[PDB]
Ligand binder design. Structure first.
Ligand SMILES: *[C@@H]1O[C@H](CO)[C@@H](O[C@@H]2O[C@H](CO)[C@@H](O)[C@H](O)[C@H]2NC(C)=O)[C@H](O)[C@H]1NC(C)=O
Ligand SMILES: OC[C@H]1O[C@@H](O[C@@H]2[C@@H](O)[C@H](O)[C@@H](CO)O[C@@H]2O)[C@H](O)[C@@H](O)[C@@H]1O
Ligand code: NAG
Ligand code: NAG
Ligand code: NAG
Ligand code: BGC
Length: 494
């Protein structure tokens, strides 16, 4: 089994010569993240956002006791592959006993569902959706800030992950897995009945965050109300689009309201050309920040079955990789936790605005911190190139640990986020496993919504993305290393 510090045991060219071998090492150590008090609570089956690790030792210290439906989506997607008997998912979940992987996934998902249902019972006002929650005790509570508030985006991610898991479980023909799947189907189906009432304001406007009068009141209690928080709507092509599809297919909207969803969204779907120095022009979908995380939706629905979409998103990775070469960055950018202050052991903040400003709606960006999970969209197109970029960042001081990759490093190598999260680690894992879009596509076809998806989304993308430039620009490989400035590898992983 591989050394903890395997990233620098390979050369870059060796990664490209045999991506699978390298990925096999990656999955093994990533899987160590999957432990009680590190990434989830085995008592209630619920994710934690992650955990801090000690500056010197690289051992788990201080967990994050909160999580959200977005991290749930990463865990559930992993479990969908695991229960289906994926050998790669087993290398993650149960490397020394692959046969146990399906049972492990089934067991946790059973415990998890029980917890979801206790939460629904105590907080029926959420209508079967999840706010940001505290998962450190047996029963979920909303985090303080998220009492009477629920986000559409995170829930959109979870729902299609559960959709995949159900399909995966039923595909096994194992009777107890099928029974588990049907209980999850019941949970998932309940959200269909509440989705429009909670999140659809009308005229194509979908709340980013819904304010609930009182989470203790049933959805249709005579005093219960739902209203959008401010004027922030799920109206763009990023992760929130998953929730749009949920409303369209299952929400009971009229044809006019479905048309209004896409009409209201249309101005946020924009073609722009990346062009810096000798790189480009490359036509891409304009990003929010052009953080890698914005591409999440392609993990969960079969966007890449549509060739115009596949081409536009392939271009994104031409731009993302080559942008880093031309601007001399030894990694790529995504929303991420900032460095740890070694004196306190605390993360100094969260950096949302990390991406590629010239092809972004939001041009005010912090670009001093890079993260391995930035490669997840690259991995979907070219796992060698993806893993080369991953390796380049992972070789930075303290950027591997006994639970796999570390959250983030400054590109100048003077600081590291001594932290593990689902977002910075298991996003990449889910990309290595090919997303769940195959499972989702199967179930969509069986429920006769696949054709509608293709027609609508091909129409929207083909209307905006014409005469692509830069499709001849090859993906770029890392040309700079993370500087060594005197940071010392974790004593358990060196
Ligand atoms: C991420 O952490 C860095 C420090 O490591 C922050 O950058 C510093 O910001 C302070 C206070 O605004 C300045 O006085 C320093 O000059 C900056 N230091 C460096 C090394 O650039 C950065 O603001 C943090 N970002 C977030 C979002 O937390
Ligand atoms: O706080 C609500 C919700 O915000 C989410 O942040 C969004 C981000 O993911 C998205 O890429 C951009 C552009 O649409 O908008 C928002 O910043 C965050 O991901 C969720 O976890 C939060 O619940
Ligand atoms: C959630 O609770 C409500 C009200 O208590 C109930 O009507 C509904 O069936 C519950 N949902 C699930 C999936 O059990
Ligand atoms: C919310 O509803 C519960 C159940 O009726 C009630 O106990 C509580 O006082 C209400 N909270 C507020 C802030 O009105
Ligand atoms: C950012 O997006 C909004 C919503 O579509 C748009 O109106 C605004 O002009 C965009 N800003 C830039 C700088 O592209
Ligand atoms: O889930 C990744 C990150 O999301 C951010 O929005 C939260 O502020 C962090 O606590 C968390 O680590």
């Amino acid at each position: 089994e591989p050394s903890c510090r395997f990233a620098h045991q390979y050369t870059q060219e060796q990664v490209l010569q045999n991506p699978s071998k390298f990925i096999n090492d990656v999955l093994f150590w990533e899987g160590k993240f999957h432990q009680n008090n590190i990434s989830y609570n085995s008592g209630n089956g619920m994710s934690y956002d992650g955990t801090n690790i000690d500056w010197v030792t690289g051992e788990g210290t201080v967990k994050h006791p909160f999580s959200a439906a977005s991290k749930e989506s990463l865990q559930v997607m992993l479990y969908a592959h695991a229960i289906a008997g994926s050998a790669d998912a087993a290398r993650f979940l149960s490397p020394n006993n692959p046969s146990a992987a399906p049972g492990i996934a089934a067991s946790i998902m059973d415990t998890k569902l029980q917890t979801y249902l206790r939460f629904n019972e105590t907080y029926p006002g959420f209508g079967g959706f999840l706010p940001w929650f505290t998962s450190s005790s047996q029963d979920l509570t909303p985090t303080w800030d998220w009492n009477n508030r629920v986000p559409g985006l995170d829930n959109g991610e979870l729902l299609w992950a559960v959709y995949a898991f159900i399909q995966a479980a039923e595909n096994t023909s194992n009777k107890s897995f099928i029974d588990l799947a049907k209980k999850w189907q019941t949970w998932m189906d309940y959200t269909k009945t509440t989705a429009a009432h909670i999140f659809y304001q009308g005229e194509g406007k979908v709340c980013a965050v819904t304010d609930i009068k009182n989470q203790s009141l049933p959805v249709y209690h005579p005093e219960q109300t739902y209203a959008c928080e401010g004027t922030s709507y799920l109206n763009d092509p990023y992760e929130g689009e998953l929730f749009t599809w949920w409303l369209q297919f299952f929400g009971g909207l009229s044809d006019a309201d479905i048309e209004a969803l896409w009409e209201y969204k249309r101005p946020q779907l924009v073609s722009v050309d990346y062009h810096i120095g000798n790189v480009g022009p490359i036509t891409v979908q304009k990003g929010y920040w052009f953080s890698s995380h914005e591409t999440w939706k392609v993990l969960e629905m079969p966007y890449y079955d549509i060739d115009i979409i596949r081409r536009v998103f392939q271009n994104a990775e031409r731009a993302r990789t080559c942008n880093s070469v031309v601007t001399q960055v030894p990694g790529m950018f995504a929303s991420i936790n900032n460095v740890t202050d070694p004196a306190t052991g605390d993360v100094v903040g969260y950096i949302s605005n990390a991406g590629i400003p010239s092809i972004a709606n939001q041009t005010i960006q912090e670009l001093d911190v890079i993260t391995p999970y930035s490669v997840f969209p690259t991995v979907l197109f070219d796992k060698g190139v993806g893993m080369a970029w991953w390796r380049n960042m992972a070789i930075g001081k303290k950027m591997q640990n006994i639970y796999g990759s570390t959250e983030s490093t400054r590109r100048d190598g003077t600081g590291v986020s001594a932290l593990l999260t689902w977002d910075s680690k298991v996003s990449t894992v889910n990309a290595i496993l090919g997303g769940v879009s195959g499972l989702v596509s199967q179930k969509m076809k069986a429920e006769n919504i696949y054709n509608t998806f293709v027609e609508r989304i091909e129409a929207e993308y083909s209307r905006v993305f014409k005469n692509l430039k830069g499709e001849h620009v090859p993906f770029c490989l890392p040309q700079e290393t993370v500087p060594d400035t005197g940071l010392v590898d974790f004593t358990t992983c060196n």
